[PDB]
Amino acid sequence: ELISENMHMKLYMEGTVNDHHFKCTSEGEGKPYEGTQTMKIKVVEGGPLPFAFDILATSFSKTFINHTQGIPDFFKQSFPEGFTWERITTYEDGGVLTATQDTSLQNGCLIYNVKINGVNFPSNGPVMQKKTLGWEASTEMLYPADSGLRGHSQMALKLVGGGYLHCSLKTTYRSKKPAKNLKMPGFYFVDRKLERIKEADKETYVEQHEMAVARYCDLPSK
Amino acid sequence: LISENMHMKLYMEGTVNDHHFKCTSEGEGKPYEGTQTMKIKVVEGGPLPFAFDILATSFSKTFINHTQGIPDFFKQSFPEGFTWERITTYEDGGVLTATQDTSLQNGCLIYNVKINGVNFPSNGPVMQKKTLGWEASTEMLYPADSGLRGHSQMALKLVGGGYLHCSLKTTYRSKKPAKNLKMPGFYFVDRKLERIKEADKETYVEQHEMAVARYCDLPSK
Amino acid sequence: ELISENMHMKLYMEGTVNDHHFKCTSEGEGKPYEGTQTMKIKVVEGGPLPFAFDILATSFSKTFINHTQGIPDFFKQSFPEGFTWERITTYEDGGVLTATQDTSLQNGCLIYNVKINGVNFPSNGPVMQKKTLGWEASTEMLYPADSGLRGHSQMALKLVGGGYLHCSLKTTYRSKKPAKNLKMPGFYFVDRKLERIKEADKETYVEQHEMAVARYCDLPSK
Amino acid sequence: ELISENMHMKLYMEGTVNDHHFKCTSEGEGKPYEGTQTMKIKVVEGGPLPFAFDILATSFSKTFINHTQGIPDFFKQSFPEGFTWERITTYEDGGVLTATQDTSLQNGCLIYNVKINGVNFPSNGPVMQKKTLGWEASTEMLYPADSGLRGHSQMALKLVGGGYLHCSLKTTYRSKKPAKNLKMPGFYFVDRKLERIKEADKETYVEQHEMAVARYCDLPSKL
């Protein structure tokens, strides 16, 4: 395939959260079939960001899911054409972050381009006041809808002092390959753990590692 | 206390949109293995004009297998018991809200449920009965609001192959004083709720649930 | 017709908010065609309530709307048979209150039967802390949907210390009269001011007054 | 003062709805104190759009609100520096449109820069099917929150064949003036009517007019 066992990525991100404009770039590498990857990210315009970098974590990679149990892999199948995703993340204290993303393969490097637009993050809440400590593990459910894949997830943001801020994600993933050339999956889950591995200079340099494994529910039917 | 085999007794009243109804049920399960079966009868208001699936999560938190040493909020709560309060919101505007009392009286678990559903659309899948039961789901739980907050989503199978989506937001509240309980931190519950029998236009239903509490499996760092 | 210019009502309410059960009853009088009405409310079981009584205010009367400009009156038309309503109110701090109601006409008296179910009101928010100070005015939009009338509104709840807690209402009103026997309205608006006029005994006795007037938007068109 | 009885505007817009990229520009003029205005709009990249232009209507001007009854005018007071706004629009059938906007005054011309990001518009919904017929009238409620103004509104989109698609708007309006150089409004309403006046070329050319008037509830209080 066009997708080898070891892969590199380059990403460009532009966005506004509330009234704050910024731009980021990243480089990473990963193991697409093993479902692991690492991104090294730079905030290159608008830094330091007045908000916790955590709210941008999920906008930095769907090729790198280990699909088990024979679940067809919508993302890997989509090459050489590529795919797009579009998401809304809604925080329980009224912040909203939308993202739309293009994924292309050029010269055997994955290229990501992301546009972020966040609005209504409370100015005295944990995100604008940087009281956050990263994400717990999460499970997304995916299934065919709207001519691609729909994904639904919920995630919990660790807060200083031991509490949690909740959010939900609703995504639609769309293949640039025609649908007659795809073996579509049915309903399944992706478990993931996205972890900050280091940061420097007021979150203007960040490293992230994710592991992502696709699976069915392993419980028996009666 | 709660044994390896327990029985349960349930009464439920509610209104969906404008339709009033009552159900009862009786069950038998294994709390530490986290399996259970409920045998349900619609006793007033049957046949319901909406799919019975929307009532499924309202018929049992004692019956979760809490593995990996996770403190068990529900089993710990007895003899005093606990409550839960939930909103289920469907993507097409239906909303089902539920509040529940769990007691224990002479070795029997006793469940009392009130239901209030609104805004279920007239020509949507629930009211037109085009649903085919729920896929498996995962709830995340963590302390909040003086008990445990649970967050789940679920996908209702539709005739023809599609899905209707719904989010659940629950608060579970122990009747046993905070000082007498060991709280868990963040964890998941995986479950599979299946209809195993029906009859008489969904006025008699049997459901089986399996539920297991765990942490994420994935290597860290 | 059966709706006179001066009318009485009696109400019975039952419900639970989080884990707290309660019952209320009330009696009222008002002027249906003028859109004004007063309800005198008693909390008869579960008093005193742990939550602000404000969250129950909108669950205590759609016959008393002044329908102006010839807008057909879905509610006064539905008698003698009556109507039902069902609503969800969603608070921006995670509280949710749903209510289902039956409105009948018996010996010249309007009879209301309300069931309340409120869930997830945060223990540190204004409702549970009893730090609220009543509602601002609001405007509902209504239009035919779902074989009845759909209503959408938003309300602002005044808070001790200043500022507001926002909620949104989504309702469906349903006539017990056949469609063929109703003149349906098109799209319109109802302006209201609901005000607490009296309270005693830790909110176990309350008096509310509402003025409601239906209209179209009066702005010139192009 | 810097805001006249007649003002002109220029706008630049960049965005993506679902996976479709586009840019728009427009110019208009209007009467800030009578709260009327007209915008003529060109799609200059990505046209003809595969979605209903109606979803972009509210992202093309808060200076043109007639603030009656003495209500302090957060927007007109903010000049020469200007203000920003950020909004989420949520459609009952799953589509979401967020927008962030900068409003500036340069050369006695009002300048708007907008970025749109919409996601998850259903393929068989009226918006993706271009089966919409413009907006009914609407009311916004506004009050101080978060060091700016919070706005909540709801709108009904007319549909081919009858009936409506609902959406809610939640906005935060932020002044570039510091708070101690502003007289802040309390709670109030804005009534508006945004109307499509002309269109050409499969909606690649559109004229909208809006009238907006600030007011309190004029029902009598019993308190």
Tell me the torsion sign for CA atoms B71, B72, B75, B81.
Answer: positive
Q: Is A218 left (phi over 0), alpha (psi -120 to 50) or beta?
A: alpha
Distance CA A156, CA B140 (A): 9
The answer to whether D132 touches D121, Cβ cutoff 8 Å, is no
* D76 DSSP assignment: G
Q: In the block, which residue shows the tokens 């609503």?
A: C87
Tell me the torsion sign for CA atoms B41, B46, B48, B51.
Answer: positive
- Structure tokens, C207: 């008096």
Residues of C in contact with A92 (CB under 8 A): 94
Cis peptide leading into residue C48 (ω within 30°):
yes
Residues of B in contact with A35 (CB under 8 A): none
Residues 6+ apart with CB under 8 A from B91: B164, B165, B166, D94
Q: Which of C82, C217, C198, C207 is nearest to C142 (CA)?
A: C217
Q: Give the start-end residues of each E strand in chain B.
A: 6-16, 19-30, 35-44, 65-66, 82-90, 95-104, 108-118, 131-134, 137-144, 147-158, 163-174, 187-199, 204-214
Which residue(s) pair with C155 in the sheet?
C167
Distance CA A77, CA A182 (A): 7
Q: How far is CA C50 from CA B86, B185, C125, C204, in A?
A: 19, 28, 12, 11
The CATH fold of domain A1-222 = Green Fluorescent Protein (2.40.155)
- Structure tokens, B50: 């909406």
Q: Which of C101, C55, C61 is nearest to C203 (CA)?
A: C55
- What is the helix (H) or strand (E) element at residue C27, kind and residue range? strand C20-31
Pairwise CB contact (< 8 Å): B167 & A166: no
The answer to whether A26 touches A188, Cβ cutoff 8 Å, is no
What's the residue count for chain A? 222
The answer to whether B110 touches B7, Cβ cutoff 8 Å, is no
Distance CA D166, CA D136 (A): 10
Q: CA nearest A142 in B: which residue?
A: B155
C 74-93: CB under 8 A from A: 92-93
Pairwise CB contact (< 8 Å): C94 & A94: no
Please give the backbone phi and psi of residue B171, each rounded to the nearest 5 degrees, phi first.
-125, 125
Q: Are strands B19-30 and B35-44 parallel, antiparallel or unpaired?
A: antiparallel
Distance CA B24, CA B204 (A): 10
Pairwise CB contact (< 8 Å): B97 & C117: yes
Q: Which of A221, A219, A213 is nearest to A71 (CA)?
A: A213
C neighbours by CB contacts (3+ pairs under 8 Å): A, B, D
Q: CA nearest A95 in C: which residue?
A: C92
Residues of A in contact with D119 (CB under 8 A): 86-88, 98-100, 170, 172
Chain centroid to Cα D113, Å, comes to 13
Tell me the residue type at A184. Answer: M
Q: CA nearest D87 in A: which residue?
A: A119
Q: What is the DSSP code string of B79-100?
A: TT-EEEEEEEEETTS-EEEEEE
Cis peptide leading into residue C144 (ω within 30°):
no
Residues of A in contact with B163 (CB under 8 A): 143, 145, 150, 187
Q: Which of A147, A145, A173 is nearest to A75 (CA)?
A: A173
The answer to whether D20 touches A115, Cβ cutoff 8 Å, is no
Residues 6+ apart with CB under 8 A from D35: D64, D65, D66, D67, D211, D212, D213, D214
Residues of C in contact with A93 (CB under 8 A): 93
A neighbours by CB contacts (3+ pairs under 8 Å): B, C, D
Q: In the block, which residue shows the tokens 């659309």?
A: B121
Distance CA D164, CA D92 (A): 10
The answer to whether A83 touches A174, Cβ cutoff 8 Å, is yes
- Structure tokens, C191: 């302006």
Distance CA B166, CA B158 (A): 13
What string of H, E and C letters represents the secondary structure of chain A? CCCCCCEEEEEEEEEEECCEEEEEEEEEEEECCCCEEEEEEEEEECCCCCCCHHHHHHHCCCCCCEECCCCCCHHHHCCCCCEEEEEEEEECCCCEEEEEEEEEEECCEEEEEEEEEEECCCCCCCCCCCCEEEECCEEEEEEEECCEEEEEEEEEEEECCCCEEEEEEEEEEEECCCHHHCCCCCCEEEEEEEEEEEEECCCCEEEEEEEEEEECCCCCCC
Q: Which of C169, C170, C216 is nearest to C190 (CA)?
A: C216
CATH class assigned to B1-221: mainly beta
Q: Please, what's the largest Cα pairwise distance for chain C?
A: 56
* Distance spanning both ends of chain B, measured CA to CA: 40
C 6-25: CB under 8 A from B: 15-16, 18-19
Q: CA nearest C166 in A: which residue?
A: A94
Q: How far is CA B68 from CA A43, C154, D26, D162, in A?
A: 40, 46, 61, 57
Q: CA nearest A99 in D: which residue?
A: D117
Q: How far is CA A24 from CA A47, A129, A130, A157, in A?
A: 9, 21, 19, 22
> Chain B contact for C167, CB < 8 A?
no
- What resolution in Å is listed for this PDB structure? 1.9
- Give the dihedral of Cα atoms C193, C197, C202, C204; nearest 10 deg: -90
Q: Nearest 5°: CA angle at D112, between D108 and D115?
A: 165
Q: Which of B153, B138, B151 is nearest to B191 (CA)?
A: B138
Residues 6+ apart with CB under 8 A from A210: A36, A37, A61, A64, A192, A193, A194, A195
Pairwise CB contact (< 8 Å): C168 & D168: yes
Tell me the torsion sign for CA atoms A155, A159, A164, A168.
Answer: negative
Distance CA D195, CA A19 (A): 28
Q: How far is CA D77 from CA C73, D13, D85, in A?
A: 43, 25, 15
The answer to whether C22 touches C15, Cβ cutoff 8 Å, is yes
Q: Considering the domain D1-223, what is its CATH architecture?
A: Beta Barrel (2.40)
Distance CA D202, CA D91 (A): 23
* Distance spanning both ends of chain D, measured CA to CA: 38
Which residue(s) pair with B35 in the sheet?
B30, B210
List chain B domain ranges. Answer: 1-221
- Give the dihedral of Cα atoms C108, C98, C119, B116; nearest 10 deg: 90
Within 10 A of B217 (CB to CB), how many other CB atoms are there?
11
Residues 6+ apart with CB under 8 A from A188: A71, A141, A142, A143, A214, A215, A216
Pairwise CB contact (< 8 Å): A19 & D84: yes
* D74 DSSP assignment: T
